[PDB]
Ligand binder design. Structure first.
Ligand SMILES: CCCCCCCC/C=C/CCCCCCCC(=O)O[C@@H](COC(=O)CCCCCCCCCCCCCCC)COP(=O)([O-])OCC[N+](C)(C)C
Ligand SMILES: CCCCCCCC/C=C/CCCCCCCC(=O)O[C@@H](COC(=O)CCCCCCCCCCCCCCC)COP(=O)([O-])OCC[N+](C)(C)C
Ligand SMILES: CCCCCCCC/C=C/CCCCCCCC(=O)O[C@@H](COC(=O)CCCCCCCCCCCCCCC)COP(=O)([O-])OCC[N+](C)(C)C
Ligand SMILES: CCCCCCCC/C=C/CCCCCCCC(=O)O[C@@H](COC(=O)CCCCCCCCCCCCCCC)COP(=O)([O-])OCC[N+](C)(C)C
Ligand SMILES: CCCCCCCC/C=C/CCCCCCCC(=O)O[C@@H](COC(=O)CCCCCCCCCCCCCCC)COP(=O)([O-])OCC[N+](C)(C)C
Ligand SMILES: CCCCCCCC/C=C/CCCCCCCC(=O)O[C@@H](COC(=O)CCCCCCCCCCCCCCC)COP(=O)([O-])OCC[N+](C)(C)C
Ligand SMILES: CCCCCCCC/C=C\CCCCCCCC(=O)O[C@@H](COC(=O)CCCCCCCCCCCCCCC)COP(=O)([O-])OCC[N+](C)(C)C
Ligand SMILES: CCCCCCCC/C=C\CCCCCCCC(=O)O[C@@H](COC(=O)CCCCCCCCCCCCCCC)COP(=O)([O-])OCC[N+](C)(C)C
Ligand SMILES: CCCCCCCC/C=C\CCCCCCCC(=O)O[C@@H](COC(=O)CCCCCCCCCCCCCCC)COP(=O)([O-])OCC[N+](C)(C)C
Ligand SMILES: CCCCCCCC/C=C\CCCCCCCC(=O)O[C@@H](COC(=O)CCCCCCCCCCCCCCC)COP(=O)([O-])OCC[N+](C)(C)C
Ligand SMILES: CCCCCCCC/C=C\CCCCCCCC(=O)O[C@@H](COC(=O)CCCCCCCCCCCCCCC)COP(=O)([O-])OCC[N+](C)(C)C
Ligand SMILES: CCCCCCCC/C=C\CCCCCCCC(=O)O[C@@H](COC(=O)CCCCCCCCCCCCCCC)COP(=O)([O-])OCC[N+](C)(C)C
Lengths: 659, 659
């Protein structure tokens, strides 16, 4: 993606880089013989190794012999070098190397060997055989004492990113499962020493590991769905799918964290009909008659009742790709729609009314202020009591403004740094609601010091206040697009047109202000291009189309003053301004193509954020789901959902081929 | 493409155009007999030719006999006329003509015959047989003494353009190779007299010739890739692919010169695994484990270390079609990205800073000049020393401006004439950087003559100077499009709208200025349409939308003055101006569809142009690549590149059909 990785030492190297002595020719000539496939040259070199071991001090002969078979810079052995280079005669050089280590008491050490390298640590001879797809060499090595629980930890086998390495699950069972080799997976699970409930350095197990390697888009061949079904259904218990890693996530919650929509649909809709495996399912269909059916969903680690539920991960954590496609799955779709009809319509309506009456009060009191030198109060709370009836509206300003500044200021403090790179993560409205409430109470405090700059701050509070009414247009679908593409346009288009337009507004502004002469004879001010600040204003009025091409200029070089104004009008009114209108037209077109996807993801935040304001006795009232016994000795919560599907049923009936 | 060619004399003609005598009927009747396929009439005419040769002076009888078989206007013989017209009985009239020339000592002359025509010179009887796909007549002619090294040079066999003729490689081996006939190619390479390392008049050989005939786009059947592999791998040496033609190019460098992207990808990625043919490859993969792999590339005639490298041909020589598609190939992609991280980010950042401070100095000194009659210096270098601290900024203008005018003026002098027909060949910024630096030093020299027209030249230097800051927006991808489509629009759209708009600005300008009368009673100037120059200005202010439809005109025919203004506003404000905005909208749309292709090709020029400023000890430091021994007795430079490809690997594993 970004950059290719660097590795400090290569795993295998048959390319010699640039810059009869038995202590050199024994060790080096075996590696080259076993790599090319010279069988006859190999037996003639092994019998020379035991010749040096007879002229050696006793009781240390296995330690001396392994040093002449293992490398020193890395822990790669003769059997590892043999299996990385597959030849047509590697079935027999395994037999010859296994026979040499059986003649000594070194067979247990020669197979269970590990790399000592910092970058390839823990890799054994089973990892090379399962990688190179040698199915019959694997059965021999298990039958000779290979550890089937060896973990391969390292910088290569556990990277930081999805590139820069190759993560598969760190066990030999997970390597066979992530390489689409179903027969070796059947082979290891039928062995007694295989620990299925095993965990790696990330805390993952085999079901966590298959989620990380799955495709985030639906395609034709999906072997990670058939491997998740195959390994789960053989264990026949609950310990795998209820286990948490170091981040505290199940296999179900890691699919919603990473964004895999096809693995998520499979787990929420499992239904197994055989009697010993009935209890593993999460959906229970009890009656169906034509198109209609009734079903029960599992709802255990899904609904908003514990921490890190799958309804809360999908909504709040943007940068996940498929968030609309997952919120329309079936246990999730009914839960959001039920929370809207039961308490969320009415809390969203009271927020619109307590804010619309806040702005009518703050406007009528600011507009109708006493405009005299002899009458100067601040228009708030009756700080000087003139005793007029219903003064509570002036009290209602300072009460409701200090509530918003406390509440929204906490929400700015709780912002993730990924919440500032999405429009849908509504971090714009947390800023602007805060600064409108600060300026209200700042203007009240500056009258108590009587500075008479309160009116500069009270005017800006009315203009932001009526501009924040654009938040509440997400209640309707039709008006919910205009608050979105007023923000796509002002970031993708206007802040890139701004840097180009200052270069032409600075350059011609200094140039036109340097060609004039001082016209103040007796305070005439004939020249409208006198200063730098006067010339930038008259050039802005000409891109808009409000100024004049006044040629009668009291200055030297009158024909050069015409050449530089007409060049400005062509570049910035005919060419640049009509260009930026054709860049707004491409942004507006793409928001309207996706108007439904954007409106539905803005409700789902407002539904789950009014739920965190409710008290606990009130949230316990609206809990949807009842206790239910779906099999023997197992109790769980459930939703009953009826579903009538006319288009799916009629295609099932027409295609049936009654002939 | 452009025009069909003309040929001075046809190659074969069976259509007689418009405007018993044995010296006429012997020669003419053989050609018509051998063309139609009259076998019995042919033997009755050959025995009449030897009757005339018995009544002839001796020792000259082969010279007399060939003149009655070869034509005179061209060198076409009886065997050539036989093979151009294929009949079902041309297997035997070859046998009859070969038997007649064997009875004399004229067999060596009768087969090895050449056209003497200016347009078809050198064409022999093997070229006609290999063209007409007669595979078994070819083996007979080789077995009778045909020259298999005859070159066919001529205006037809070596044209100027790709049309106007048919270039194939000028040898009989290249004709068989460029006509998709693999069996005749095997036939000639197994003959001993075949010179494989042979060159034609262009200097090309068989591997150069196959590059010129290849398709520049990837399609299904590509026989030129299978012929390049077939002929190279049989020679088994290095003389073919390291040979240069008259322009000094290898077969590798001619593919990048002509733009063939599929031949270029094949050569840079050859990998042959068998032991006698291991050494011919250019990529050496030494370890691979799942998706990741490590490889070594050849880098010999690719990297910027000699003249005409393939990294330098693709970048500088536009008019080549596939330049983005070739710069993303693998030895080329890593080299450009490595030169950016090691020295090119920092040289592109110092150029932005030494030019941005050049414009702040030249603006603040021009704007704050002494505006008095008693104070008139030139604002540069303290030509009159007033002794103010840090005068070095005024010195910094004339130093840095004379550097740019020398450096950019050399670059204008080194421009190819094809560099002035591409936006991406940045010949616009070589002009405008030059003229901004000339006007600075021109204004300094005109104060030394004290002409007081220096200020007309110093003002234009500020306006161009801030407009050249649009060059440095190619560092970012998002802003790198606005400098491009400000140039596509001002060439494809505005200079075509300009010729149409002058016709309506000239015609109505003279017409409206002829209907008025002189209003200067006592210097009133009531009529704003008095002159030609006054009327063109008031009509330009009305297309923009700044003028007035002032009907109160002090002139004769007042209702005709209304009819010609309203006709102008409809034609040029409602119709023409809104048309040109819909022609800018189609240009802006196509630049944004190709925004990534244009930004990436502008970096690649700036990377290779800061490299030509570095000194030789500094360029020798940043050389990337190490000496390496990839096979016996062969040393070469290499890059090691790691590559992890998740999408290619997982499709290889899912499609494997483990069943
Ligand atoms: C029908 C079936 C049952 C329905 C259940 C009903 C449950 C009722 C409540 C239950 C508990 C909730 C307490 C929340 C209070 C927080 C106050 C607040 O700041 O407003 C918050 C919400 O405001 C509300 O959601 C509640 C509105 C009623 C407030 C009750 C006190 C005043 C009622 C006295 C009546 C008048 C007295 C006389 C007045 C003249 C504003 O939050 P926001 O809109 O999200 O902010 C803008 C968005 N932004 C975050 C991006 C910036
Ligand atoms: C001088 C140097 C040369 C010039 C600079 C050159 C470099 C600049 C280039 C940079 C990256 C290139 C991408 C092009 C678009 C750039 C804009 C951007 O950064 O958006 C980024 C994220 O968008 C956001 O940041 C969302 C806004 C967060 C809330 C901020 C509130 C501001 C309050 C203040 C009140 C203001 C009121 C306005 C309302 C907020 C990236 O956008 P994107 O990659 O296209 O991804 C689309 C995702 N999207 C849905 C979020 C859009
Ligand atoms: C002069 C110019 C104007 C000013 C300019 C301002 C401009 C800016 C404003 C622009 C637009 C304004 C936005 C409107 C805001 C809310 C409306 C809304 O949400 O729409 C909804 C209607 O929902 C309702 O109408 C509320 C339900 C009844 C509430 C009854 C009172 C509460 C009583 C309880 C008191 C509690 C206890 C009391 C306290 C203790 C529509 O939703 P729906 O159609 O129903 O369903 C969704 C469709 N779906 C099913 C496909 C998903
Ligand atoms: C970090 C790792 C190592 C990095 C290696 C760093 C190597 C450094 C250098 C190494 C040798 C290069 C010499 C090039 C000099 C040419 C001068 C020139 O005209 O500028 C040229 C480039 O300018 C540069 O690229 C270099 C900028 C530094 C100049 C050094 C002298 C002044 C430093 C004293 C410091 C301040 C003293 C105090 C001042 C107050 C302009 O070229 P351009 O931008 O292409 O032109 C515009 C484009 N156009 C062609 C279309 C028109
Ligand atoms: C009176 C008679 C009747 C009217 C005339 C009728 C006949 C006229 C018709 C002619 C051909 C028909 C094609 C239509 C487009 C015409 C324009 C053209 O010639 O472009 C040609 C090449 O484009 C260039 O020349 C690139 C600019 C080179 C640098 C020049 C710097 C000038 C500095 C001065 C400063 C000025 C500042 C502005 C910035 C430079 C051809 O363009 P194209 O075929 O479309 O190929 C696209 C390739 N492209 C990527 C290069 C675009
Ligand atoms: C007030 C209004 C403003 C005025 C209006 C002006 C408006 C006009 C201007 C518009 C935009 C301005 C353009 C910015 C120009 C350079 C920035 C740039 O290149 O971007 C790059 C940042 O590269 C860097 O930031 C430089 C790296 C650090 C330099 C450290 C100082 C040098 C020290 C050494 C001293 C040497 C020795 C000293 C002397 C002897 C971004 O590139 P990237 O993201 O890093 O990678 C590319 C992404 N890729 C990997 C996909 C390919
Ligand atoms: C389209 C235009 C784009 C924006 C440009 C707008 C300009 C702002 C530019 C930049 C903005 C930031 C600086 C603030 C300047 C404004 C303050 C001011 O006006 O007061 C004064 C300063 O006026 C000046 O003379 C200074 C402005 C020109 C030089 C700017 C600094 C150059 C270096 C920056 C970059 C390199 C450093 C980076 C190094 C890494 C004006 O005083 P006065 O009017 O004479 O009043 C007379 C009365 N009196 C005598 C009693 C005092
Ligand atoms: C892209 C990000 C831009 C940020 C803003 C984005 C939006 C921009 C929108 C608006 C902001 C733009 C400014 C307009 C209003 C001027 C305010 C002012 O204080 O001027 C004053 C000072 O200013 C000067 O003295 C002018 C100095 C001349 C050269 C300025 C650029 C040189 C430094 C470049 C620095 C880097 C800039 C490079 C920019 C490419 C006016 O002074 P005066 O009239 O000369 O004196 C007359 C005396 N009198 C007052 C008593 C009568
Ligand atoms: C960014 C826009 C460019 C900025 C503009 C700078 C461009 C410069 C480039 C090149 C200029 C090269 C010529 C040298 C200057 C000579 C000075 C001179 O003659 O002044 C004379 C006038 O003359 C003029 O009117 C100005 C002539 C400009 C040439 C046309 C350039 C077209 C640029 C457009 C396309 C660019 C597209 C670029 C796209 C990015 C003096 O005036 P006068 O007649 O003596 O008046 C006295 C009258 N009296 C009789 C009453 C006393
Ligand atoms: C939208 C309009 C489009 C452009 C049209 C613009 C017009 C320019 C047309 C063409 C431009 C090139 C010629 C330069 C003319 C300008 C010089 C000038 O004005 O000075 C004078 C010449 O004024 C005239 O009278 C001559 C202009 C009209 C006829 C043009 C030539 C026709 C032949 C060309 C083609 C056929 C040949 C081709 C053969 C193959 C003006 O003098 P004055 O104002 O009377 O001053 C009075 C004071 N005095 C008496 C002391 C002197
Ligand atoms: C497409 C390429 C075009 C090139 C430019 C592209 C951009 C064009 C933009 C601007 C240039 C256009 C000119 C506008 C400014 C006029 C300058 C001038 O010198 O006028 C003067 C002379 O001119 C005359 O005398 C006018 C002659 C009348 C007929 C003109 C066309 C006949 C020849 C057609 C030749 C072929 C043209 C065919 C064109 C289709 C004004 O003279 P006056 O006012 O009459 O005298 C009053 C006396 N007084 C001054 C003392 C008061
Ligand atoms: C390029 C545009 C065309 C140019 C225009 C030429 C077109 C000509 C074609 C044809 C004209 C044929 C008629 C002959 C002329 C007679 C003269 C006459 O009658 O004048 C009279 C007025 O009369 C008028 O107002 C003008 C009549 C024009 C006819 C409408 C044509 C529509 C063109 C549009 C569509 C074209 C689309 C083309 C698309 C490219 C005299 O005026 P008066 O009333 O005596 O005023 C004195 C008043 N007072 C004394 C009472 C105070």
């Amino acid at each position: 993606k970004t950059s290719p990785p660097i590795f400090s030492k290569p795993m295998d190297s048959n390319i010699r880089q640039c810059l009869r002595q038995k202590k050199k020719r024994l060790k080096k000539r075996i590696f080259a013989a076993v790599s090319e496939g010279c069988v006859e040259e190999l037996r003639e070199l092994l019998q020379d190794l035991q010749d040096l071991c007879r002229r050696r001090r006793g009781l240390d002969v296995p330690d001396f012999l392994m040093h002449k078979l293992t490398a020193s810079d890395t822990g790669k052995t003769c059997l590892m070098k043999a299996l990385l280079n597959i030849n047509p005669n590697t079935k027999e050089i395994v037999r010859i190397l296994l026979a040499f280590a059986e003649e000594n008491d070194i067979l247990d050490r020669f197979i269970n060997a590990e790399y000592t390298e910092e970058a390839y640590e823990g890799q054994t001879a089973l990892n090379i055989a399962i990688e190179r797809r040698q199915g019959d060499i694997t059965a021999v090595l298990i039958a000779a004492g290979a550890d089937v629980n060896a973990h391969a930890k390292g910088v290569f086998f556990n990277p930081k990113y999805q590139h820069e390495g190759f993560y598969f699950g760190e066990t030999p069972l997970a390597l066979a499962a992530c390489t689409n080799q179903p027969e070796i997976v059947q082979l290891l699970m039928e062995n007694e020493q295989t620990d299925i409930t095993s965990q790696d350095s990330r805390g993952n197990n085999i079901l966590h590991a298959l989620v990380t390697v799955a495709e985030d888009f639906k395609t034709q061949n999906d072997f990670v769905k058939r491997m998740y079904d195959m390994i789960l259904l053989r264990s026949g218990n609950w310990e795998l799918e209820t286990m948490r890693n170091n981040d505290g996530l199940t296999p179900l919650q890691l699919a919603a964290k990473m964004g895999k929509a096809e693995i998520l649909k499979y787990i929420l809709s499992r239904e197994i009909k055989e009697k010993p495996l009935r209890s593993l399912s999460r959906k229970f269909t009890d009656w169906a008659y034509g198109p209609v059916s009734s079903s029960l969903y599992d709802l255990t680690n899904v609904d908003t009742t514990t921490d890190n539920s799958v309804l809360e991960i999908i909504v709040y954590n943007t940068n996940i790709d498929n968030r609309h496609e997952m919120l329309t799955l079936e246990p999730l779709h009914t839960l959001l729609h039920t929370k809207w009809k039961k308490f969320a319509k009415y809390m969203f309506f009271l927020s619109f009314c307590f804010y619309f009456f806040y702005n009518i009060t703050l406007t009528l009191v600011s507009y109708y202020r006493p405009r005299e030198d002899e009458d100067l109060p601040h228009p708030l709370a009756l700080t000087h009591k003139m005793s007029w009836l219903q003064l509570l509206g002036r009290m209602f300003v300072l009460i409701w403004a200090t509530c918003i500044s406390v509440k929204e200021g906490i929400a700015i403090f709780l912002l993730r740094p990924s919440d500032l790179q999405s429009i849908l993560s509504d971090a714009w409205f947390h800023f602007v609601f805060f600064v409108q409430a600060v300026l209200v109470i700042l203007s009240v405090f500056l009258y108590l010091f009587a500075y008479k700059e309160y009116l500069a701050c009270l005017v800006l509070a009315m203009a932001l206040g009526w501009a924040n009414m654009l938040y509440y247009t997400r209640g309707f679908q039709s008006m919910g697009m205009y608050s979105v593409m007023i923000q796509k346009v002002i970031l993708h288009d206007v802040l890139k047109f701004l840097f180009v337009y200052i270069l032409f507004l600075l350059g011609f502004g200094v140039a036109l202000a340097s060609l004039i002469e001082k016209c103040s004879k007796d305070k005439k001010d004939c020249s409208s291009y006198g200063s730098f600040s006067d010339a930038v204003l008259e050039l802005f009025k000409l891109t808009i189309g409000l100024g004049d091409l006044n040629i009668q200029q009291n200055s030297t070089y009158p024909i050069l003053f015409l050449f530089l104004l007409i060049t400005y009008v062509i570049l910035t009114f005919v060419l640049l301004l009509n260009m930026l209108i054709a860049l707004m037209g491409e942004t507006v077109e793409n928001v309207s193509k996706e108007s439904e996807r954007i409106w539905r993801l803005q409700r789902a935040r407002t539904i789950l954020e009014f739920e965190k304001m409710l008290p606990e006795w009130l949230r316990s009232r609206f809990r949807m789901g009842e206790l239910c016994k779906v099999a023997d000795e197992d109790f769980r919560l459930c939703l009953r959902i009826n579903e009538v599907k006319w288009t799916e049923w009629k295609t099932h009936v027409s295609f049936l081929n009654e002939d």
